[PDB]
Protein backbone atom coordinates (compact mmCIF):
# COMPACT_ATOMS: atom_id res chain seq x y z
CA UNK A 1 0.00 0.00 0.00
CA UNK A 2 0.98 3.66 -0.47
CA UNK A 3 1.01 6.55 2.00
CA UNK A 4 -1.52 9.00 0.56
CA UNK A 5 -2.48 12.03 2.71
CA UNK A 6 -5.27 13.82 0.81
CA UNK A 7 -5.65 17.52 0.34
CA UNK A 8 -6.83 19.60 3.25
CA UNK A 9 -9.34 22.42 2.73
CA UNK A 10 -7.71 25.18 0.71
CA UNK A 11 -8.82 27.69 3.34
CA UNK A 12 -7.11 25.66 6.06
CA UNK A 13 -3.92 25.42 3.98
CA UNK A 14 -4.01 29.14 3.19
CA UNK A 15 -4.10 30.10 6.90
CA UNK A 16 -1.04 27.94 7.52
CA UNK A 17 0.80 29.79 4.77
CA UNK A 18 -0.28 33.15 6.21
CA UNK A 19 1.61 32.24 9.38
CA UNK A 20 4.78 31.95 7.27
CA UNK A 21 4.18 35.14 5.37
CA UNK A 22 5.45 37.71 7.93
CA UNK A 23 8.80 35.90 7.99
CA UNK A 24 9.27 36.71 4.30
CA UNK A 25 10.09 40.30 5.32
CA UNK A 26 12.42 39.36 8.16
CA UNK A 27 15.74 39.20 6.32
CA UNK A 28 18.18 39.73 9.19
CA UNK A 29 20.60 36.82 9.52
CA UNK A 30 19.24 35.92 12.96
CA UNK A 31 15.82 35.41 11.37
CA UNK A 32 16.77 34.06 7.92
CA UNK A 33 15.38 30.56 7.62
CA UNK A 34 16.21 28.25 4.67
CA UNK A 35 13.61 25.75 5.89
CA UNK A 36 10.84 28.35 5.47
CA UNK A 37 11.89 29.00 1.85
CA UNK A 38 12.01 25.28 1.06
CA UNK A 39 8.66 24.57 2.68
CA UNK A 40 7.02 27.37 0.72
CA UNK A 41 8.51 26.37 -2.66
CA UNK A 42 7.31 22.79 -2.13
CA UNK A 43 3.84 23.99 -1.15
CA UNK A 44 0.80 25.00 -3.20
CA UNK A 45 1.36 28.55 -1.95
CA UNK A 46 3.73 31.34 -2.97
CA UNK A 47 4.89 34.78 -1.80
CA UNK A 48 5.72 36.08 -5.29
CA UNK A 49 8.63 38.50 -5.61
CA UNK A 50 9.29 38.29 -1.86
CA UNK A 51 10.72 34.81 -2.45
CA UNK A 52 13.44 36.03 -4.79
CA UNK A 53 14.59 38.63 -2.26
CA UNK A 54 14.53 35.96 0.44
CA UNK A 55 16.78 33.63 -1.56
CA UNK A 56 19.08 36.53 -2.38
CA UNK A 57 19.39 37.30 1.35
CA UNK A 58 20.14 33.63 2.05
CA UNK A 59 22.96 33.55 -0.52
CA UNK A 60 24.41 36.84 0.73
CA UNK A 61 24.36 35.77 4.36
CA UNK A 62 25.48 32.16 4.06
CA UNK A 63 28.29 32.65 1.56
CA UNK A 64 29.80 35.78 3.18
CA UNK A 65 29.68 34.50 6.74
CA UNK A 66 30.92 30.88 6.11
CA UNK A 67 33.58 31.60 3.39
CA UNK A 68 34.98 35.05 4.32
CA UNK A 69 28.60 39.20 10.10
CA UNK A 70 26.32 38.81 13.11
CA UNK A 71 26.85 35.15 13.95
CA UNK A 72 27.53 32.42 11.39
CA UNK A 73 25.15 29.81 10.03
CA UNK A 74 25.79 26.37 11.55
CA UNK A 75 26.72 23.47 9.30
CA UNK A 76 23.26 21.96 9.84
CA UNK A 77 21.75 25.23 8.67
CA UNK A 78 24.13 25.19 5.69
CA UNK A 79 22.61 21.83 4.78
CA UNK A 80 19.12 23.39 4.73
CA UNK A 81 20.49 26.26 2.66
CA UNK A 82 21.53 23.60 0.14
CA UNK A 83 17.93 22.35 0.08
CA UNK A 84 16.86 25.94 -0.58
CA UNK A 85 19.09 26.02 -3.67
CA UNK A 86 17.42 22.85 -5.01
CA UNK A 87 14.03 24.46 -4.33
CA UNK A 88 15.02 27.09 -6.88
CA UNK A 89 16.33 24.47 -9.36
CA UNK A 90 19.96 25.38 -8.69
CA UNK A 91 22.98 23.19 -8.11
CA UNK A 92 25.57 24.54 -5.71
CA UNK A 93 28.33 25.77 -8.00
CA UNK A 94 31.30 28.03 -8.62
CA UNK A 95 34.31 28.41 -6.35
CA UNK A 96 32.27 29.65 -3.42
CA UNK A 97 29.77 26.82 -3.96
CA UNK A 98 32.52 24.18 -4.09
CA UNK A 99 33.97 25.49 -0.81
CA UNK A 100 30.59 25.34 0.92
CA UNK A 101 30.23 21.72 -0.16
CA UNK A 102 33.61 20.79 1.30
CA UNK A 103 32.75 22.56 4.55
CA UNK A 104 29.62 20.40 4.86
CA UNK A 105 31.70 17.33 3.98
CA UNK A 106 34.13 18.32 6.78
CA UNK A 107 31.19 18.55 9.18
CA UNK A 108 30.23 14.96 8.35
CA UNK A 109 33.82 13.77 8.56
CA UNK A 110 34.22 15.35 12.02
CA UNK A 111 30.99 13.78 13.25
CA UNK A 112 32.13 10.43 11.85
CA UNK A 113 35.38 10.78 13.82
CA UNK A 114 33.48 11.83 16.96
CA UNK A 115 31.18 8.80 16.69
CA UNK A 116 34.24 6.55 16.36
CA UNK A 117 34.96 3.04 15.00
CA UNK A 118 33.77 1.52 18.31
CA UNK A 119 30.48 3.41 17.54
CA UNK A 120 30.34 4.19 21.29
CA UNK A 121 31.10 7.92 20.86
CA UNK A 122 28.20 10.41 20.32
CA UNK A 123 28.11 13.04 17.53
CA UNK A 124 28.69 16.68 18.62
CA UNK A 125 25.31 17.57 17.17
CA UNK A 126 22.60 14.97 16.50
CA UNK A 127 22.03 12.03 14.19
CA UNK A 128 19.24 14.22 12.79
CA UNK A 129 21.81 16.72 11.51
CA UNK A 130 24.08 13.88 10.39
CA UNK A 131 21.26 12.53 8.19
CA UNK A 132 20.30 16.02 7.04
CA UNK A 133 23.88 16.66 5.92
CA UNK A 134 24.04 13.44 3.89
CA UNK A 135 20.68 14.25 2.30
CA UNK A 136 21.71 17.82 1.41
CA UNK A 137 24.91 16.63 -0.31
CA UNK A 138 23.08 13.83 -2.11
CA UNK A 139 20.44 16.27 -3.46
CA UNK A 140 23.26 18.16 -5.15
CA UNK A 141 24.71 14.89 -6.44
CA UNK A 142 27.73 14.99 -4.19
CA UNK A 143 28.97 11.62 -2.99
CA UNK A 144 29.82 10.56 0.54
CA UNK A 145 31.87 7.54 1.53
CA UNK A 146 30.26 4.24 2.51
CA UNK A 147 31.95 4.59 5.90
CA UNK A 148 29.83 7.76 6.46
CA UNK A 149 26.58 6.10 5.43
CA UNK A 150 27.29 3.23 7.84
CA UNK A 151 26.97 5.41 10.95
CA UNK A 152 23.42 6.32 9.88
CA UNK A 153 22.66 2.76 8.75
CA UNK A 154 23.43 1.67 12.33
CA UNK A 155 21.60 4.58 14.04
CA UNK A 156 18.31 3.48 12.47
CA UNK A 157 18.01 -0.09 13.71
CA UNK A 158 15.49 -0.34 16.59
CA UNK A 159 17.74 -1.30 19.47
CA UNK A 160 20.65 1.06 18.55
CA UNK A 161 19.99 3.73 21.25
CA UNK A 162 21.89 6.65 19.67
CA UNK A 163 18.48 8.38 19.60
CA UNK A 164 14.81 7.45 19.82
CA UNK A 165 13.57 10.21 17.53
CA UNK A 166 10.89 9.71 14.88
CA UNK A 167 12.13 12.91 13.27
CA UNK A 168 15.70 11.59 13.06
CA UNK A 169 14.56 8.23 11.72
CA UNK A 170 12.44 10.01 9.08
CA UNK A 171 15.28 12.31 8.08
CA UNK A 172 17.64 9.32 7.86
CA UNK A 173 15.12 7.51 5.92
CA UNK A 174 15.02 10.55 3.65
CA UNK A 175 18.82 10.51 3.36
CA UNK A 176 18.80 6.75 2.60
CA UNK A 177 16.09 7.27 -0.03
CA UNK A 178 18.10 9.96 -1.81
CA UNK A 179 21.17 7.68 -1.85
CA UNK A 180 19.10 4.81 -3.24
CA UNK A 181 17.36 6.88 -5.93
CA UNK A 182 20.68 8.41 -6.97
CA UNK A 183 22.39 4.99 -7.01
CA UNK A 184 25.03 6.40 -4.66
CA UNK A 185 27.15 4.21 -2.37
CA UNK A 186 26.57 1.01 -4.41
CA UNK A 187 28.77 -0.90 -1.96
CA UNK A 188 26.10 -0.25 0.68
CA UNK A 189 23.07 -0.64 -1.60
CA UNK A 190 21.48 -3.67 0.10
CA UNK A 191 22.00 -2.24 3.59
CA UNK A 192 20.59 1.11 2.47
CA UNK A 193 17.54 -0.71 1.06
CA UNK A 194 17.09 -2.68 4.29
CA UNK A 195 17.54 0.47 6.42
CA UNK A 196 14.69 2.22 4.59
CA UNK A 197 12.36 -0.69 5.44
CA UNK A 198 13.63 -0.66 9.04
CA UNK A 199 12.80 3.04 9.40
CA UNK A 200 9.35 2.41 7.84
CA UNK A 201 8.54 -0.30 10.39
CA UNK A 202 9.79 1.66 13.39
CA UNK A 203 7.80 4.74 12.38
CA UNK A 204 4.61 2.73 11.83
CA UNK A 205 5.21 1.26 15.35
CA UNK A 206 5.50 4.74 16.94
CA UNK A 207 1.92 5.54 15.93
CA UNK A 208 -0.19 6.93 18.78
CA UNK A 209 -3.83 5.74 19.34
CA UNK A 210 -4.75 9.29 18.23
CA UNK A 211 -2.97 8.74 14.87
CA UNK A 212 0.28 10.72 15.12
CA UNK A 213 3.71 9.19 14.53
CA UNK A 214 5.40 9.82 17.88
CA UNK A 215 4.13 13.39 18.33
CA UNK A 216 1.91 15.88 16.37
CA UNK A 217 5.13 17.58 15.44
CA UNK A 218 6.93 14.40 14.35
CA UNK A 219 4.06 13.50 12.00
CA UNK A 220 4.97 15.96 9.19
CA UNK A 221 8.51 14.67 8.65
CA UNK A 222 7.36 11.11 9.25
CA UNK A 223 4.76 11.52 6.50
CA UNK A 224 7.36 13.03 4.15
CA UNK A 225 9.45 9.89 4.51
CA UNK A 226 6.53 7.44 4.31
CA UNK A 227 5.32 9.11 1.09
CA UNK A 228 8.56 8.40 -0.77
CA UNK A 229 8.26 4.61 -1.14
CA UNK A 230 5.77 1.76 -1.19
CA UNK A 231 5.64 -0.55 1.83
CA UNK A 232 4.51 -4.01 0.75
CA UNK A 233 3.02 -6.34 3.35
CA UNK A 234 2.14 -3.42 5.60
CA UNK A 235 -1.06 -1.38 5.72
CA UNK A 236 0.62 1.94 4.99
CA UNK A 237 -2.53 3.41 3.46
CA UNK A 238 -4.56 2.84 6.61
CA UNK A 239 -1.83 4.17 8.88
CA UNK A 240 -1.49 7.35 6.84
CA UNK A 241 -5.25 7.98 6.70
CA UNK A 242 -5.37 7.66 10.48
CA UNK A 243 -2.53 10.18 10.64
CA UNK A 244 -4.50 12.70 8.50
CA UNK A 245 -7.40 12.37 10.89
CA UNK A 246 -5.01 13.15 13.74
CA UNK A 247 -3.37 15.90 11.72
CA UNK A 248 -6.70 17.48 10.79
CA UNK A 249 -7.88 17.56 14.41
CA UNK A 250 -4.58 19.11 15.49
CA UNK A 251 -4.77 21.76 12.75
CA UNK A 252 -8.33 22.73 13.65
CA UNK A 253 -7.17 23.03 17.26
CA UNK A 254 -4.38 25.47 16.36
CA UNK A 255 -1.45 23.10 16.95
CA UNK A 256 0.75 24.53 14.17
CA UNK A 257 1.97 28.02 15.06
CA UNK A 258 5.72 27.58 14.72
CA UNK A 259 7.12 28.60 11.29
CA UNK A 260 9.59 25.70 11.02
CA UNK A 261 6.87 23.15 11.85
CA UNK A 262 4.60 24.70 9.21
CA UNK A 263 7.47 24.59 6.71
CA UNK A 264 7.82 20.84 7.33
CA UNK A 265 4.06 20.24 6.99
CA UNK A 266 3.22 22.35 3.91
CA UNK A 267 5.07 20.05 1.46
CA UNK A 268 3.04 17.08 2.75
CA UNK A 269 -0.21 18.97 2.14
CA UNK A 270 0.93 19.49 -1.48
CA UNK A 271 1.90 15.82 -1.97
CA UNK A 272 5.59 16.70 -1.93
CA UNK A 273 8.62 15.85 0.17
CA UNK A 274 12.29 16.84 0.36
CA UNK A 275 12.97 13.96 -2.08
CA UNK A 276 11.18 16.01 -4.76
CA UNK A 277 14.29 18.22 -4.64
CA UNK A 278 16.12 15.64 -6.75
CA UNK A 279 13.98 16.60 -9.76
CA UNK A 280 12.39 19.91 -8.69
CA UNK A 281 9.41 21.40 -10.56
CA UNK A 282 9.97 25.11 -9.94
CA UNK A 283 7.34 26.47 -12.32
CA UNK A 284 4.37 24.48 -11.02
CA UNK A 285 1.53 26.94 -10.35
CA UNK A 286 1.11 28.13 -6.76
CA UNK A 287 -1.52 30.38 -5.19
CA UNK A 288 -0.34 33.86 -4.24
CA UNK A 289 -0.48 34.39 -0.47
CA UNK A 290 -1.98 37.69 0.65
CA UNK A 291 -1.57 39.05 4.18
CA UNK A 292 -4.39 37.92 6.43
CA UNK A 293 -6.31 41.10 7.08
CA UNK A 294 -8.03 40.55 28.53
CA UNK A 295 -8.12 37.77 31.24
CA UNK A 296 -5.34 37.60 33.88
CA UNK A 297 -3.49 34.29 34.33
CA UNK A 298 -1.09 33.10 37.07
CA UNK A 299 1.65 30.64 36.03
CA UNK A 300 4.02 29.10 38.59
CA UNK A 301 7.68 29.05 37.48
CA UNK A 302 9.78 26.39 39.22
CA UNK A 303 13.57 25.74 38.77
CA UNK A 304 14.49 22.85 41.22
CA UNK A 305 17.87 22.09 39.50
CA UNK A 306 19.40 25.43 40.59
CA UNK A 307 20.48 26.00 44.25
CA UNK A 308 18.97 28.14 45.84
CA UNK A 309 15.76 26.67 44.23
CA UNK A 310 13.13 28.94 42.53
CA UNK A 311 9.30 28.62 42.86
CA UNK A 312 7.18 31.73 42.09
CA UNK A 313 3.68 32.53 40.73
CA UNK A 314 3.77 34.97 37.80
CA UNK A 315 0.68 36.84 36.66
CA UNK A 316 0.39 37.39 32.88
CA UNK A 317 -2.44 38.14 30.38
CA UNK A 318 -4.01 34.96 28.90
CA UNK A 319 -2.52 33.68 25.61
CA UNK A 320 0.90 34.71 26.97
CA UNK A 321 3.94 32.58 25.92
CA UNK A 322 6.31 30.79 28.41
CA UNK A 323 8.88 33.41 27.27
CA UNK A 324 6.37 36.10 28.28
CA UNK A 325 6.15 34.51 31.79
CA UNK A 326 10.00 34.36 31.88
CA UNK A 327 10.30 38.05 30.89
CA UNK A 328 7.90 39.07 33.71
CA UNK A 329 9.95 36.99 36.16
CA UNK A 330 13.06 38.99 35.20
CA UNK A 331 11.17 42.29 35.80
CA UNK A 332 9.79 41.18 39.23
CA UNK A 333 13.36 40.14 40.13
CA UNK A 334 15.36 37.06 41.05
CA UNK A 335 15.22 35.57 37.53
CA UNK A 336 17.79 35.63 34.70
CA UNK A 337 17.53 33.50 31.50
CA UNK A 338 19.53 33.45 28.26
CA UNK A 339 18.31 32.51 24.75
CA UNK A 340 20.07 31.63 21.45
CA UNK A 341 18.69 31.95 17.91
CA UNK A 342 17.41 28.82 16.16
CA UNK A 343 15.44 28.20 12.95
CA UNK A 344 12.68 26.83 15.24
CA UNK A 345 12.89 30.02 17.38
CA UNK A 346 14.39 31.05 20.73
CA UNK A 347 16.34 28.25 22.55
CA UNK A 348 17.00 28.46 26.32
CA UNK A 349 20.77 28.40 26.83
CA UNK A 350 20.76 29.54 30.52
CA UNK A 351 18.51 29.78 33.63
CA UNK A 352 19.66 31.85 36.68
CA UNK A 353 23.29 32.07 35.54
CA UNK A 354 23.62 28.36 34.86
CA UNK A 355 24.20 27.60 31.18
CA UNK A 356 23.93 24.05 29.93
CA UNK A 357 27.15 22.16 29.13
CA UNK A 358 27.88 19.50 26.58
CA UNK A 359 25.08 16.89 26.37
CA UNK A 360 22.98 19.10 28.73
CA UNK A 361 19.76 20.98 27.77
CA UNK A 362 17.19 22.92 29.77
CA UNK A 363 14.00 20.85 29.46
CA UNK A 364 10.67 22.65 29.56
CA UNK A 365 8.10 20.62 31.49
CA UNK A 366 4.60 20.99 32.95
CA UNK A 367 3.92 19.10 36.20
CA UNK A 368 3.82 16.28 36.66
CA UNK A 369 7.15 15.68 34.79
CA UNK A 370 5.45 15.97 31.37
CA UNK A 371 7.92 17.34 28.80
CA UNK A 372 6.50 20.21 26.66
CA UNK A 373 6.13 19.49 22.89
CA UNK A 374 6.50 23.24 22.09
CA UNK A 375 9.10 25.97 22.67
CA UNK A 376 9.05 28.92 25.06
CA UNK A 377 7.59 31.29 22.38
CA UNK A 378 5.13 28.72 20.94
CA UNK A 379 3.64 27.28 24.20
CA UNK A 380 0.94 29.21 25.99
CA UNK A 381 0.25 27.98 29.53
CA UNK A 382 -3.31 27.31 30.88
CA UNK A 383 -4.26 28.98 34.21
CA UNK A 384 -2.84 27.24 37.30
CA UNK A 385 -0.17 25.44 35.25
CA UNK A 386 3.26 24.87 36.80
CA UNK A 387 6.01 25.42 34.20
CA UNK A 388 9.34 23.94 35.21
CA UNK A 389 12.80 24.39 33.74
CA UNK A 390 15.06 21.33 34.46
CA UNK A 391 18.72 20.86 33.41
CA UNK A 392 18.83 17.36 31.99
CA UNK A 393 21.40 15.32 30.08
CA UNK A 394 20.65 14.23 26.50
Amino acid sequence: EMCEIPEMDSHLVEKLGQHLLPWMDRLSLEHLNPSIYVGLRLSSLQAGTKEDLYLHSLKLGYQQCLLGCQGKPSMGQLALYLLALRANCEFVRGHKGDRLVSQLKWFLEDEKRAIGHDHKGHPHTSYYQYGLGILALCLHQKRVHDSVVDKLLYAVEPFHQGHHSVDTAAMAGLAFTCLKRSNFNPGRRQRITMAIRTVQEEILKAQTPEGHFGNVYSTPLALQFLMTSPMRGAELGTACLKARVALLASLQDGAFQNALMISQLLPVLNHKTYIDLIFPDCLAPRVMLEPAAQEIISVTLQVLSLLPPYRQSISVLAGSTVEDVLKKAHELGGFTYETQASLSGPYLTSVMGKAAGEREFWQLLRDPNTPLLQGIADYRPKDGETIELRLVSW
Epitope: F159, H160, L204, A206, P209
Partner: nanobody, 122 residues
Framework: LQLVESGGGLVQAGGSLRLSCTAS?????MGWFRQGPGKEREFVAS????????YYADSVKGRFTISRDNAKNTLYLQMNSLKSEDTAVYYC???????????????????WGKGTRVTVSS
Protein backbone atom coordinates in the same frame (compact mmCIF):
# COMPACT_ATOMS: atom_id res chain seq x y z
CA LEU B 1 0.46 6.96 36.91
CA GLN B 2 0.13 3.86 39.08
CA LEU B 3 1.31 0.41 37.97
CA VAL B 4 0.43 -2.71 40.01
CA GLU B 5 2.12 -6.06 39.15
CA SER B 6 0.66 -9.56 39.82
CA GLY B 7 1.50 -13.32 39.50
CA GLY B 8 5.02 -14.85 39.55
CA GLY B 9 6.08 -17.27 42.36
CA LEU B 10 8.53 -20.27 42.84
CA VAL B 11 8.63 -22.27 39.56
CA GLN B 12 10.71 -25.31 38.52
CA ALA B 13 12.87 -24.76 35.41
CA GLY B 14 10.77 -25.30 32.25
CA GLY B 15 8.67 -22.91 33.29
CA SER B 16 5.27 -21.37 32.31
CA LEU B 17 5.03 -18.24 34.62
CA ARG B 18 2.41 -15.69 33.11
CA LEU B 19 2.94 -12.29 35.02
CA SER B 20 0.68 -9.14 34.90
CA CYS B 21 0.71 -5.32 35.34
CA THR B 22 -2.36 -3.02 35.35
CA ALA B 23 -2.20 0.75 35.11
CA SER B 24 -4.44 3.53 36.39
CA UNK B 25 -4.41 5.28 33.00
CA UNK B 26 -3.57 4.90 29.31
CA UNK B 27 0.19 5.05 28.73
CA UNK B 28 2.34 5.17 25.59
CA UNK B 29 5.02 2.51 25.97
CA MET B 30 4.80 -0.19 28.61
CA GLY B 31 7.66 -2.52 29.36
CA TRP B 32 9.08 -5.07 31.73
CA PHE B 33 12.54 -4.94 33.40
CA ARG B 34 14.27 -7.64 35.54
CA GLN B 35 16.79 -6.91 38.31
CA GLY B 36 19.24 -9.67 39.29
CA PRO B 37 19.78 -9.35 43.07
CA GLY B 38 22.77 -7.02 43.60
CA LYS B 39 23.11 -6.25 39.85
CA GLU B 40 21.46 -2.93 38.73
CA ARG B 41 18.46 -3.58 36.39
CA GLU B 42 18.13 -5.18 32.89
CA PHE B 43 15.62 -4.46 30.06
CA VAL B 44 13.27 -7.36 29.26
CA ALA B 45 10.56 -6.32 26.78
CA SER B 46 8.51 -3.36 25.51
CA UNK B 47 5.07 -3.23 23.88
CA UNK B 48 3.85 0.11 22.45
CA UNK B 49 0.20 0.72 21.38
CA UNK B 50 -0.19 -0.85 17.95
CA UNK B 51 -0.10 -4.54 17.01
CA UNK B 52 3.36 -6.08 17.21
CA UNK B 53 5.07 -3.09 18.76
CA UNK B 54 6.85 -5.85 20.64
CA TYR B 55 10.48 -5.42 21.55
CA TYR B 56 12.52 -8.22 23.21
CA ALA B 57 15.92 -8.48 24.90
CA ASP B 58 17.95 -11.27 23.21
CA SER B 59 17.98 -13.30 26.47
CA VAL B 60 14.18 -13.86 26.45
CA LYS B 61 13.53 -14.27 22.70
CA GLY B 62 11.68 -17.60 22.09
CA ARG B 63 10.18 -17.60 25.67
CA PHE B 64 8.97 -13.98 25.44
CA THR B 65 5.32 -13.19 24.46
CA ILE B 66 4.84 -9.60 25.78
CA SER B 67 1.11 -8.75 25.18
CA ARG B 68 -1.04 -5.62 25.82
CA ASP B 69 -4.75 -5.05 26.43
CA ASN B 70 -5.29 -1.45 25.38
CA ALA B 71 -8.90 -1.50 26.58
CA LYS B 72 -7.86 -2.45 30.12
CA ASN B 73 -4.48 -0.71 30.29
CA THR B 74 -2.86 -4.02 31.20
CA LEU B 75 0.30 -5.70 29.86
CA TYR B 76 1.49 -9.36 30.35
CA LEU B 77 4.68 -11.56 29.96
CA GLN B 78 4.13 -15.33 29.22
CA MET B 79 7.69 -16.30 30.33
CA ASN B 80 7.67 -20.00 29.20
CA SER B 81 10.87 -22.23 29.40
CA LEU B 82 12.37 -20.50 32.53
CA LYS B 83 16.12 -20.87 33.59
CA SER B 84 18.63 -19.89 36.39
CA GLU B 85 19.14 -16.32 35.14
CA ASP B 86 15.40 -15.69 34.98
CA THR B 87 15.46 -15.54 38.82
CA ALA B 88 15.08 -11.82 39.44
CA VAL B 89 12.61 -9.14 40.47
CA TYR B 90 10.40 -8.21 37.50
CA TYR B 91 9.29 -4.56 37.39
CA CYS B 92 6.56 -3.14 35.20
CA UNK B 93 7.21 0.31 33.72
CA UNK B 94 5.45 2.97 31.65
CA UNK B 95 6.02 6.28 29.80
CA UNK B 96 3.48 8.58 28.11
CA UNK B 97 5.69 9.00 25.09
CA UNK B 98 5.96 6.59 22.14
CA UNK B 99 9.44 6.94 20.66
CA UNK B 100 11.54 5.36 17.88
CA UNK B 101 11.93 1.75 19.06
CA UNK B 102 13.74 -0.01 21.85
CA UNK B 103 13.78 2.54 24.65
CA UNK B 104 15.73 -0.24 26.58
CA UNK B 105 17.45 1.97 29.15
CA UNK B 106 15.87 2.93 32.47
CA UNK B 107 15.50 6.71 32.68
CA UNK B 108 13.32 6.51 29.61
CA UNK B 109 10.49 5.25 31.83
CA UNK B 110 8.86 7.52 34.43
CA UNK B 111 6.47 5.16 36.18
CA TRP B 112 7.47 1.92 37.94
CA GLY B 113 5.79 -0.80 39.98
CA LYS B 114 6.99 -2.47 43.14
CA GLY B 115 7.88 -5.65 41.31
CA THR B 116 7.08 -9.31 41.41
CA ARG B 117 10.04 -11.50 42.31
CA VAL B 118 10.31 -14.71 40.27
CA THR B 119 12.57 -17.62 41.38
CA VAL B 120 13.43 -20.81 39.36
CA SER B 121 14.50 -24.11 41.05
CA SER B 122 17.41 -26.32 39.76
Amino acid sequence: LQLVESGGGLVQAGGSLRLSCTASGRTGTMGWFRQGPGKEREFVASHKWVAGSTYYADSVKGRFTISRDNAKNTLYLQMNSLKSEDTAVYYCAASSQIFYGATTSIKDFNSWGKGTRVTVSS
